[PDB]
């Protein structure tokens, strides 16, 4: 359990130094299962696009901007107001919203028969209750969520039978086709900004500095290295009598400065979109190092007095919109938005450490007694690994299991002469380097010489499992002692000659790590002569 | 063992609704150990003072202020520079810094003797090596950190014995007494601001808005509900040709506004500290609802041209300092800073939920087989709890343990007439309410009528363990079957007459929760007649 405070204090007062040294034994090492690097840290991991969104919220807030949420869904005529006649072309880029009608369907008599053939007992009453539920669904008074519930309730059947009725008796529901409206999703924040400002200016003291960082949707040819069907705009508007394009320049500098950028460039936007005053629509470029090229991070301009007029705004307004995903690409060094935004549809490679922590000890003794017995036994072997043969090393110990004592005589030996007790590889340690697994000896005596610079490099740069051959071997041995005791076996022999695989030293690897090791076509080279012979007797 | 995708898809494709209902069995319920509320959420918990510090950094950053770190340690003469002659009084509140000298000690034969008597073999060489280590320590070239190491290294002894030599041969080290200096800890940010500003003004374009939120130290008579020896100042300075107290007023308003405050008060500071221009030192008050009274959150003013002059600053400077702990007291509703700041030295009461999650099931079967057997058995009893006596309920089941079959006949009965199989309390459920534990029946027939409004209230407002008597009872029974098999026992009877304690239904409570249950003088009332007789035979 825990340790004796009194005994520790007394031992320490007799002689502090001995006590400090000796008292280390009161601190147990962890179960082999849970030693580093098999012990992994757990922490929450943010998404780059969303951390960039928060950092942008704060870059705007720290410039005095007031945070807003604008309408997402806007009528097409809003886009005609802002873009003018150009909207008959620009509206190609916007998603229209469409939706299913309600079905007008009735009950009886063929349907009544279907429902009866389902095993349902229907009154006239039940038939009317359901006739009403269907009416209400036609008239829009019941949600789709709720229709299985209401049917079930109507006929007094199970929920699932409600669904059964729905799909069996009324399959014409499947013939509903979505019909489009005049409503669209905003393709940039502006489509909302006008609506928000039109209502807001008259109520507020100018100048206004507003911002919103929120989703926008474009209907594009395809998705790109730098384009998605849905993106995030880090948009703002500055409203005031004296506003000009320079305000956009200053907002772009202030946003980018806070992210570390010292160099960006402005460049006229050939499009000259009509919601912007002529010759004010400006592109902002920042440098993407991994791509080598300059990338468009933002766009700004001053709204056209014509659009502003159509929204009852009589004062100039500067707009700036920065694409969150672009900035994020630069920040985190991604070269493909699709792979940055949705990394789940791509691959998750395991590092040397990841793999080193997926290498586990197979059989280990379950009982504390024998686990410690194992550790001690390991240290014993490591102490006599060089005994000159013929050798033997006995360990007799008594274990008490309630009433009965059993005495375990584990003996590990070497009959044949001119040998040593254990062999050149018993202390080999399993490393992982560059996707490879190597069981490496502490010194390269007798190692083939092409191999040595590789193993030296893995031993230097790679990640260790901190498991030696001897460790897994002995845990296997003592686990076999436990196994023996519950199996009514009094004697057995156990031997590890030349080690050829992970299995041979009682280790295994998580299948996910194997799949990669193979897939990347790398090696698991665990090998060595480890001639360990043991006999155990259980009296 | 996961579930069969192919079998599922096929079952679902035959008849979706049946399949949807039936496949619930493929979602295994959790081990009783890990069912809510014994399963607790785990998350990191911020400290109110530090969370308030961060929110304050952001309140300052969002006003355009530039964040700084100022010197913490300042010479007393700095305080005379700022406070003028008043510093001969004000310096009372400041901590002086002191430190103990290096000892001048030599070796020589009396000590050499001690070191030998310690068991250490000392050469002339070792003696000279240690003579140097002691020299270097006098001359300040060895850190205290490092001295036990160096001593050991000198004498070629263990680390711990380096320490032993240190404390045994040179105990005069203990006679070192601390000598004071002229250095003090800052008692407010101002003591740093001047220094910082003196260096910074010449290098920068005015106006400057700087802020720092960092520790300050005062020597108070004693610590208060609202005073600690060390506190955090959320200080700032506004530097510019046109600053006046009004800048302090807007900084105080802007800080407090962002925290939700719509209401604060200004009040002249009777002190008229001399580092502030006359009649500008202002106190800021905010309302502490729980205390009922108005509390001082901040202080501001304009530095005195005399103090500014002594720092080579020729332009007015407004300073404001808000005490973080005060603001935190208001925000989180604490009435005692010492208890808000250092809550570990106070008490941690366990909520009803806390205690309900510290009620554990004692014995539960280890083998999946018997665990499920147990659940099945529970449902069987709950199904036959009302069988009219004489009753009996057999459950014969055969279990396979590698080679051998064993057949377990669990029989649950009631020989005596005019009763039922189980009894009125068998489905009672354990609740926690207002620090109390109650085992409560689903209905209040036969309950003394004094009790009923209480138990009704606990059942409505309290927190349930979601364990019924029958649950713990049966887990105990089957656990005993397991014990039996391992113990070579083929028959036993098992009976639960009237329930009197938690133990009677195989439950126990965490020691920490009991300590409170007792300390707070509350009850653990679980009792009921649950007459369950069972016989178990193992063939």
């Amino acid at each position: 359990m825990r340790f004796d405070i009194k005994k520790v204090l007394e031992l320490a007062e007799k002689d502090f130094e001995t006590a400090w040294r000796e008292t280390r034994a009161l601190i147990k090492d962890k179960h082999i299962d849970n030693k580093y690097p098999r012990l992994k840290p757990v922490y929450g991991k943010p998404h780059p696009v969303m951390e960039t969104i928060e950092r942008l919220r704060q870059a705007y807030l720290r410039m005095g901007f007031e945070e807003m949420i604008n309408p997402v869904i806007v009528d097409e005529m809003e886009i005609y107001k802002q873009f003018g006649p150009e909207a008959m072309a620009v509206l190609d880029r916007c998603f229209y919203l469409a939706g299913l009608p309600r079905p007008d369907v009735g009950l009886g008599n063929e349907k009544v028969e279907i429902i009866k053939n389902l095993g349902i007992d229907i009154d006239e009453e039940k038939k009317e209750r359901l006739r009403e539920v269907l009416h209400l669904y036609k008239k829009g008074a019941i949600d789709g969520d709720d229709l299985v519930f209401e049917i079930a309730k109507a006929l007094n059947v199970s929920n699932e039978m409600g669904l059964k009725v729905l799909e069996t008796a009324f399959p014409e529901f499947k013939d509903l086709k979505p019909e489009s409206t005049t409503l669209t999703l905003r393709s940039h924040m502006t489509s909302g900004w006008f609506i928000t400002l039109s209502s807001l200016i008259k109520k507020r003291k100018l100048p206004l500095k507003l911002f919103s960082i929120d989703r926008c949707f474009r209907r594009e040819q395809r998705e790109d290295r730098s384009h998605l069907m849905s993106y995030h705009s880090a948009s703002c508007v500055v409203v005031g009598e004296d506003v000009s394009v320079d305000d956009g320049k200053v907002v772009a500098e202030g946003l980018l400065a806070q992210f570390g950028f010292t160099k960006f460039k402005f460049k006229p936007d050939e499009k000259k979109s009509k919601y912007y005053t002529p010759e004010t629509q400006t592109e902002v470029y920042a440098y993407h190092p991994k791509l080598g090229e300059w990338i468009e991070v933002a766009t700004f301009g001053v709204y056209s007095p014509i659009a502003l007029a159509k929204y009852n705004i009589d004062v100039p307004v500067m707009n700036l919109g920065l694409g969150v995903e672009r900035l994020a690409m630069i920040i985190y060094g991604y070269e493909d938005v699709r792979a940055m935004v949705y990394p789940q549809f791509y691959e998750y490679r395991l590092s040397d450490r990841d793999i080193a922590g997926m290498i586990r000890v197979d059989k280990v003794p379950i009982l504390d007694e024998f686990y410690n017995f194992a550790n001690e036994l390991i240290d014993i072997c490591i102490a006599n690994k060089d005994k000159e043969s013929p050798c033997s090393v006995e360990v007799k110990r008594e274990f008490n299991f309630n009433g009965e004592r059993r005495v375990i005589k584990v003996e590990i030996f070497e009959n044949e002469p001119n040998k040593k007790l254990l062999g050149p590889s018993v202390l080999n340690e399993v490393y992982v380097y560059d996707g490879n697994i190597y069981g490496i000896p502490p010194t390269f005596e007798g190692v083939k010489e092409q191999y040595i610079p590789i193993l030296k490099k893995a031993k230097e740069e790679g990640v260790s499992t901190n498991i030696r051959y001897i460790d897994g071997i002995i845990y296997k041995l003592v686990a076999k002692i436990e196994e023996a005791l519950v199996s009514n076996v009094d004697e057995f022999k156990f031997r590890v000659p030349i080690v050829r695989s992970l299995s041979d030293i009682n280790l295994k690897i998580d299948e996910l790590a194997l799949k990669q090791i193979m897939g990347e076509n790398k090696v698991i080279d665990v090998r060595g002569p480890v001639f360990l012979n043991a006999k155990v007797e259980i009296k | 063992m996961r579930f069969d995708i192919k079998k599922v898809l096929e079952l679902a494709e035959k008849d979706f609704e049946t399949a949807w209902r039936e496949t619930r069995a493929l979602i295994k319920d959790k081990h009783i150990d890990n069912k809510y509320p014994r399963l607790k959420p785990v998350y990191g918990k911020p400290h109110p003072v530090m969370e308030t510090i961060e929110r304050l950094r952001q309140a300052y950053l969002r006003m355009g202020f530039e964040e700084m770190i100022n010197p913490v340690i300042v010479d007393e003469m700095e305080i005379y520079k700022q406070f003028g002659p008043e510093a001969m009084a004000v310096l009372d509140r400041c901590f002086y810094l002191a430190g103990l000298p290096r000892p001048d000690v030599g070796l020589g034969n009396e000590k050499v003797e001690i070191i030998k008597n310690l068991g250490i073999d000392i050469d002339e060489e070792k003696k000279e090596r240690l003579r140097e280590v002691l020299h270097l320590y006098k001359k300040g070239a060895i850190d205290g950190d490092d001295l036990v190491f160096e001593i050991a290294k000198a004498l070629n002894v263990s680390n711990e014995m380096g320490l032993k030599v240190l404390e045994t041969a040179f105990p005069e080290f203990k006679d070192l007494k601390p000598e004071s200096t002229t250095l003090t800890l800052r008692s407010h940010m101002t003591s740093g601001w001047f220094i910082t500003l003196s260096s910074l003004i010449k290098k920068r374009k005015l106006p400057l808005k700087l802020f720092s939120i960092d520790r300050c130290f005062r020597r108070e008579q004693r610590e208060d509900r609202s005073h600690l020896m060390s506190y955090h100042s959320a200080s700032c300075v506004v530097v510019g040709e046109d600053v006046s107290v009004d800048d302090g007023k807007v900084v105080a308003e802007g800080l407090l506004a962002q925290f939700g405050f719509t209401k604060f008060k200004f009040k002249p500071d009777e002190k008229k500290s001399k580092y502030y221009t006359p009649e500008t030192q202002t106190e800021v008050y905010a309302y502490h609802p729980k205390l009922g009274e108005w509390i001082e959150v901040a202080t501001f003013g304009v530095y005195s041209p005399i103090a500014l002059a002594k720092y080579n600053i020729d332009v007015p400077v407004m300073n404001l300092g808000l005490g973080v702990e005060r603001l935190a007291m208001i925000i989180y509703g604490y009435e005692d800073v010492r208890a808000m700041v250092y809550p570990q030295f106070y008490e941690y009461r366990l909520s009803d939920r806390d205690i309900a999650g510290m009620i554990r099931v004692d014995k539960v079967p280890i083998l999946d087989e018997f665990y499920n057997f147990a659940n099945e058995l529970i449902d069987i009893c709950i199904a036959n709890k009302d069988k009219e006596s004489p009753c009996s309920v057999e459950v014969k089941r055969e279990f396979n343990f590698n080679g051998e079959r064993r057949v377990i006949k669990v029989e649950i009965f009631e020989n005596e007439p005019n009763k039922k199989l189980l009894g009125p309390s068998v489905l009672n459920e354990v609740y926690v309410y207002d620090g109390n534990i109650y085992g409560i029946p689903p209905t209040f027939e036969g309950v003394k009528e004094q009790y009923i409004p209480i138990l009704k209230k606990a059942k409505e407002e309290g927190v349930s363990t979601n364990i019924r008597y029958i649950d713990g009872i049966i887990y105990k029974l089957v656990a005993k079957i397991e014990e039996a098999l391992v113990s070579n026992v083929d028959e036993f009877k098992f009976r639960v007459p009237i329930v009197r304690s938690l133990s009677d239904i195989n439950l126990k409570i965490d020691e920490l929760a009991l300590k409170q249950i007792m300390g707070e003088n509350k009850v653990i009332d679980v009792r009921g007649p649950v007459f369950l007789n069972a016989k178990v035979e193992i063939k």
Partner: peptide, 26 residues
């Protein structure tokens, strides 16, 4: 560890096997 739990359950079951066959041996 999920593997350990099952190993220990394995030890338990073979202990019961051995007990059963040691019974019907006698």
């Amino acid at each position: 560890n999920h593997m350990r739990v099952e190993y220990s359950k394995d030890l338990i079951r073979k202990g019961i096997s051995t007990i059963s066959q040691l019974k019907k041996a006698k």
